[PDB]
Design an enzyme around this catalytic site. Sequence first.
Site, short mmCIF file in Angstrom:
data_model
loop_
_atom_site.label_atom_id
_atom_site.label_comp_id
_atom_site.label_asym_id
_atom_site.label_seq_id
_atom_site.Cartn_x
_atom_site.Cartn_y
_atom_site.Cartn_z
N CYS A 1 0.82 -1.20 0.00
CA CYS A 1 0.00 0.00 0.00
C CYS A 1 0.86 1.26 0.00
O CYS A 1 0.51 2.25 -0.64
CB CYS A 1 -0.95 0.00 1.20
SG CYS A 1 -0.20 -0.50 2.78
N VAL B 1 0.16 4.48 -2.40
CA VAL B 1 -0.24 5.81 -1.94
C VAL B 1 0.69 6.87 -2.52
O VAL B 1 0.23 7.87 -3.09
CB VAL B 1 -0.27 5.85 -0.40
CG1 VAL B 1 -0.48 7.26 0.10
CG2 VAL B 1 -1.38 4.95 0.12
#
Lengths: 477, 477, 522, 522
Positions: free
Chosen positions: C152, C156
């Site tokens: 992740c 991001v």
Amino acid sequence: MSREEVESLIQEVLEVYPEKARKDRNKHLAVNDPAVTQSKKAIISNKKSQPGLMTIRGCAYAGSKGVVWGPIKDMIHISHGPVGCGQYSRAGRRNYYIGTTGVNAFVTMNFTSDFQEKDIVFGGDKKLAKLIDEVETLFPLNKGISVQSECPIGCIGDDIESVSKVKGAELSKTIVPVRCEGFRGVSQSLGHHIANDAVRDWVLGKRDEDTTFASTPYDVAIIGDYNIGGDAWSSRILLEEMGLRCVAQWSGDGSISEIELTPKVKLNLVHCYRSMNYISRHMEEKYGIPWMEYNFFGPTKTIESLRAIAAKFDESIQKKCEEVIAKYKPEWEAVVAKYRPRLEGKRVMLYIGGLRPRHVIGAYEDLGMEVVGTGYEFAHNDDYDRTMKEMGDSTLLYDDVTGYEFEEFVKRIKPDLIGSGIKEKFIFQKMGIPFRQMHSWDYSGPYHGFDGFAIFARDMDMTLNNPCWKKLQAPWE
Amino acid sequence: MSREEVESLIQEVLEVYPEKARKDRNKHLAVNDPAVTQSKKAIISNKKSQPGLMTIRGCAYAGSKGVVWGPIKDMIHISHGPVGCGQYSRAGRRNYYIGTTGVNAFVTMNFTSDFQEKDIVFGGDKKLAKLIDEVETLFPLNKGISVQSECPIGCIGDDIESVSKVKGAELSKTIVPVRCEGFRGVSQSLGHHIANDAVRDWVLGKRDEDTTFASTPYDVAIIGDYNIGGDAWSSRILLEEMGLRCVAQWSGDGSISEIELTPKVKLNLVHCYRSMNYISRHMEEKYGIPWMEYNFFGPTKTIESLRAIAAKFDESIQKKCEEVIAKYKPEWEAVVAKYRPRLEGKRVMLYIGGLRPRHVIGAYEDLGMEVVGTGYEFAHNDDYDRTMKEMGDSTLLYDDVTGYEFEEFVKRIKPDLIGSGIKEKFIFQKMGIPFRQMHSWDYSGPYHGFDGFAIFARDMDMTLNNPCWKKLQAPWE
Amino acid sequence: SQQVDKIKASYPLFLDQDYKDMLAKKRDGFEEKYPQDKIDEVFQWTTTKEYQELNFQREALTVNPAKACQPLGAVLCALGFEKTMPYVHGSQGCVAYFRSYFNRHFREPVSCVSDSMTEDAAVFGGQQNMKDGLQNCKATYKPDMIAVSTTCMAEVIGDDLNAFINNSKKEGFIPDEFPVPFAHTPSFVGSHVTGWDNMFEGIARYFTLKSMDDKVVGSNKKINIVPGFETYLGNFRVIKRMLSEMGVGYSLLSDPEEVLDTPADGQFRMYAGGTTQEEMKDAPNALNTVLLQPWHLEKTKKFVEGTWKHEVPKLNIPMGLDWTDEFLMKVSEISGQPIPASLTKERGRLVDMMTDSHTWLHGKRFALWGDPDFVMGLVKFLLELGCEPVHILCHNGNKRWKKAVDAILAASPYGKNATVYIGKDLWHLRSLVFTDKPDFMIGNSYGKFIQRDTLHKGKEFEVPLIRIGFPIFDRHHLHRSTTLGYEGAMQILTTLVNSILERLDEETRGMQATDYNHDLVR
Amino acid sequence: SQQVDKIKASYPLFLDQDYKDMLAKKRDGFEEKYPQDKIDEVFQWTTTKEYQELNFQREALTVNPAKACQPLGAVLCALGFEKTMPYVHGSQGCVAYFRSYFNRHFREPVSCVSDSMTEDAAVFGGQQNMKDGLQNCKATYKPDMIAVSTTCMAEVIGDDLNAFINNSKKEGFIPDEFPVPFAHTPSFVGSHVTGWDNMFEGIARYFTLKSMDDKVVGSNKKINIVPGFETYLGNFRVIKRMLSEMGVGYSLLSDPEEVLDTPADGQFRMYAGGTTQEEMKDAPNALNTVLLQPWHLEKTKKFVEGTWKHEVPKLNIPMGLDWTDEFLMKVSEISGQPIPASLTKERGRLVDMMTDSHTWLHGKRFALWGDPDFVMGLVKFLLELGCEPVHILCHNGNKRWKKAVDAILAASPYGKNATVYIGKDLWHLRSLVFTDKPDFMIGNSYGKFIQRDTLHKGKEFEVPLIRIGFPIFDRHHLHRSTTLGYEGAMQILTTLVNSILERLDEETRGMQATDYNHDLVR
Ligand code: ICS
Ligand code: ICS
Ligand SMILES: [Fe+3]
Ligand SMILES: [Fe+3]
């Protein structure tokens, strides 16, 4: 193997790397010299992992949620972010506790905010405030909440400290924000420090101006025992047979109330130096509470620790200490008499986290085995300061070992037993090398204390001498 | 199917036989005429089986040890002979009981003398005497022993009657010798008779001069209910709600004392006429106790039976009888309302032993089903006297049916459901014909009484209408 | 204390009196624990319908999920290719978890690398981590292919995988011809099964998108098989076995069964078997492509239909009797190969077992959870057995899937009591098995804590767990089983009926109380 | 009373209060039952060493045997031949029991006929029964062969089977060329495994004794395989599977796996598959003959060695790692075929499973029973896992066999606590598991009553049953499993280790008491 031969093996293994990685990894591999007191000139540690070499390290969230905070049984810990962290870390670590799970204790549960894209784009602070309310409704007996930040929380930039402050004031509840995102630090070790600072800033000082607890000269705290397989319990009983009163356990089977009481004790007994020395130094600096390091692995170290601890008190504690030692003397002697003959001379290599690679050495020598190689995933140089005097001369040390280094070292050194983690276990079973999990104890234990030594010995014997290891080569092959 | 078509079916099936077997089996097949009272002119029964035609019959040992004596719970029954009979018959019949097995009850245990060749050559009478002593030592709470003879005992010329007398006198214990060797008779049926004579001759008269039992006018005995899946309990509760006192059950969940107390009852209620009518007649002749046949399969027969039994007593019993019917009326009407629409018009073929092939027809008819064929393994002609008035016109009757006959009849008649034994079940499931075991209740039950009817209907529905039966043909075939 | 010849581990060591006494003093002295009366009162409350309504009103809190994040499925997908190293661009902690998660389910080694992006990469991006990471991976572990996924963190900050990988090749960190397929696998979208789909599409694209000129559908006389996220070795093996049984030429795209079951013969094999690069490059020339788990292979479906121009058949997962029948019949039609007698016999033997054990299975009520294709297939088979699925939970399911399962339930009388839940977790299901109790659960190891909770109310409320799914950590070698085809249906059936008979035997084991029904023969 | 929407069967119906009150009045009124204090006092006595000493002094009483009689094995043997009807000369009750016994274990049809000898045959003999029976059986069920065995009735009266069959052929009840092999099978000698041996040697003699002149050992390049008394279908299949894998030509003599597993496709098959008569006639031309269960094939061995002149190798039952290794090496030696790579891998996957589960298996204590070859093979594998066989019971074992098992136990440290019992029954074993308690039993369904007894003493005294053997009546479809070869070794190992973990999970399910050790990962 001789010093020069070990040095050749290191260099031969390093040949496969590109120049940039080869230069770095060379600094993390060394031939032990027990005379050295500043390990910094033989081996470097606590540095970033080289990309793509299959390190065994975890992240800072693992060191904070998985290690330090998660064991605390009567609080609810929120894995804040996407669904992964809280699921893969759900009940993987055997930090044991006594409680009613789902009612007043919550260790093996996975609370998470389960981020979706909408939360990444617009932030999760509104979700977290609602999540906190929902926790309070469905779990009214919780005694506090912690918010374990996963990678995106810092990246997205959410302000969980404000949420914790506002919701903590509104609901008159202790809510602890922990900035343990996995991109911070280089290993689990920074997770420890972040978590220790979170304990310091949001929990430890709540009873500073409360004088309610009646202290006695024999009040201690077990600091840095996470009760793997019950370790802390088989350590606590010995301390209290000695006449001391264990006010708190950090954090295995730990309650938030007994954290808040710890500044009232007279002595902090530190098992895991790596993860808990930070709060210990703080409590010495703020409350004047001394701390000391001890070791409850194997009878030799257990006896040495009991006597060293009792010496800090009075003659009555010292008399009880020798009664504890006398009580268990036939017990561990019987274990040695049974199992040392089955293990004398066997050679073992270890690779664990930040303490046990040096801390279990004495237990193996109590069974007549020799630690020929050891290392840490994430230890610092003050851990290696404490290791080199504990290992024999010309043995092998490796910091943040890569999968390729560890396999090749093992192929050359040919140990009789390996003690490491779950990502290593099944590799070495295939090679026909007995393996014992020295994180989870292979779902056995405890290993601490006198009662644990019996289980440790039984376990090492059962695996090393098992019949299965004689059968890997087919008789027609 | 008309009579001319069922008659043609019988003749077509018989063309496979050699002349001798053809002539005999023709006598054991008939097309029903409900008006008949002398069944001997339409069907022959209780004859030897034709060799090599795969009869479903058992032996007289099954009728004595398996059926009549085995259920008696506080007695120990010795399978006397080689190891086979006692092992194949161990706990195969679900005669249920309440007891502490191995201590005070012994039904599901297999006691045997396990004959070897030395016992055949020198005889087993010495072994039997020693076995009785060993039973007495290791099972002290047994209230009596029975000796169930297997085939060789009679052929070897052993004298078990002398052993029972001498050992029974020595140890002051009831020891019953039963000559139920499997070569006697032609089926299980003679086993009933032999066992009934053994009860008469060795047990039943022991309290003839004992008047210490307190009698009431409402004392009855349930004769010939072996408590398959609890049949006798779900019948006993109705009789006692009616205001009667059930002093004994023969022999499901029966104790040796309640047998010894049976000559003190006022009326014998016979369910299984085939197996127990012999002892019933004897108890009328000797003690003056009347007996009546009754039927507790399905609400219609159960109500008629309850009212017939109550009429033999005073106005108070009859009043409780109508109160019992009123209580259970909403219950069986709810069973009918739910399951009859799922079963209406479905056709059933039965083949069982000596009672149920006629006794359960009323239960099926209460669910709107039609019994298009039935038959017995070992019934006599007075069983068939009672059957033909219960079966529809031009239905198919078969005595001691052969495996070949039964399959061929079913192929032609194409019933929706078959009810028979374990040796039949899996044949017809391969054929895609729903099957219910009507001996073991397919490990369900009870089926007797009002509480048994609810289970009976549920079982017929679950099997007949199960989704598995729509799937036997591969969709590409 | 310890008896050296009868050593006690944690259980039952801490039941010794001195340990009990110690633990009582710890609680009383320093834990400030809630009174046992209050604890009992709250627990009873959590089993009530009142609590259930509050439970299902959750909008932000998740408790005990039944799903994992994308890169876990991308890793499992990558493992199925020959001499391929899974590589997760992002933070290293994620890989430590992925490997341990799979280590504990398969009890096998699981290899996977990270390029260890730290806070420095959070500000400047992780391009340098990719350059050095690919060079270090290729030199040290010598894979023929590196399949890249993301954590992740990398998603991001928005790292451009294509640009990073191109630059690694342009600047000489890895040969330009070395295959490096990639896929973005954000954990905050979908679940682990989405990561498998994304990774597979990324590999299929890499080898075929720019080479479609010379392809002709049907030219290699094979059928492609895409298994999806699959954690039962038997399921790989039963598919390959049935296709070889019919003489169907096939290509199983992503095949980790060799590398997840290497022999313990003295040497560690990092790589073994797997789908070859040649098989991917040639895959467009197949007659068609079959997706074994279509409800998490939708992006793969779009690519195969849109680019390879295959008419991907509308097939359910081959679980149970009906859907295995349809699978074999569709395969027969596409390949022109007939269904042999040996499979027709195997089918009839399954029916035979269904007839042999239909009475014990009839009407039994189940709660079940797992991944979408697994769950519906399980619901389908339970209906075929005449069982009642009551609570059906799919944490990572969607509305389209729910409607399709509701239709299956509507088509059978045995579905009249079922409810399908999507987006609900195992704390939701716990309340369901208290208020509307079934006879069993069918789920993964996480269900054991629900069984613990039910038993605590009372023995009559206990809902035993039957372990079918992923992950299974507390039993050994169940990953060797099968759930697809007739063979898998045979094994599920035997599990269900014998779980039922085991529980009956426990309930009737009390002498002179319940053992009147302790039958020898069932 | 009953609620129509929640109908109760015997359990838990009879726990309703009105049924409890009724059964109480039944006991107190008319059962003259011993006081409960005495019952509890006597039960406790049956668990003591004092009782065990009296128990083991038995000389005449047998209680709960672990064996059956000869003809049951003769029937199973006969069923393994093509279109063969088992035919038991004697009384019909025996055949009704043989069929029901097998029906409940296999959950399949079992065909077998009697000629229904009655009391007149005790004086006059049963020749007429044989004459009409053979004609009736051939005409009605149209077998290609009729294999004759005997009940104890026919053995005591001394019927001459050969004369009866010869007179039946002479007088035209059956064609002179119709095959009617026979064997005398006295139930008061040996056990069911003895009857299997007798019937097989009788069939082998029928087809080969009078035609040996044109036979040449090794001329057909096959190996004959004799399975013996075998009730796990997978065991027939696993042997055929490995031999086909090595490309070894073979003939399985007596093969009932097809007829005991026919599909439910709308038609009932009386006969299916099986060893052909031509395979029997040609058997002497094999390279050699291997006996899979040699300890109950002694008569067969004598004939094969004495008449066929085959050098039958000294192989144990292929159970476990070592004895499957030896079997495959011996077949490779006789056939000249190498052990292929696929079987070397399978072996290495079994070794891996042993390394994965060794920690939970170490030191676990077992009591076990069954037939000789099965029992000794199970004892060998338990030793290979590092388990302690403590009580080893073989009711139908002999002195020589005991001597062989004691030696196997003497060769391993894990056999130091073992005792081998022959001629003892399950009432003997009940006392052993009370006085010298093991962790589990491995046996057949009759062991379930031992577990009941132990639990009654207390939960801490309960010895759970693991169901491996024959017969298995109270679980479904375990007859399909495997115990031989690596495949069987993996199945036994999986069953053992997971039975250990299931019991642990139950012992640690109590919240706040023992669930501290209720680990998610094991
Ligand atoms: S003892 Fe602790 S989980 Fe301090 S239980 Fe755990 S060998 Fe970890 S972060 Mo495994 S508090 Fe040691 C640890 Fe750290 S087993 Fe090792 S790596 S430095
Ligand atoms: S005849 Fe009846 S099912 Fe009364 S059909 Fe059945 S040999 Fe049973 S309970 Mo098999 S009414 Fe006899 C019977 Fe009882 S065949 Fe035997 S055991 S005492
Ligand atoms: Fe493994
Ligand atoms: Fe079947």
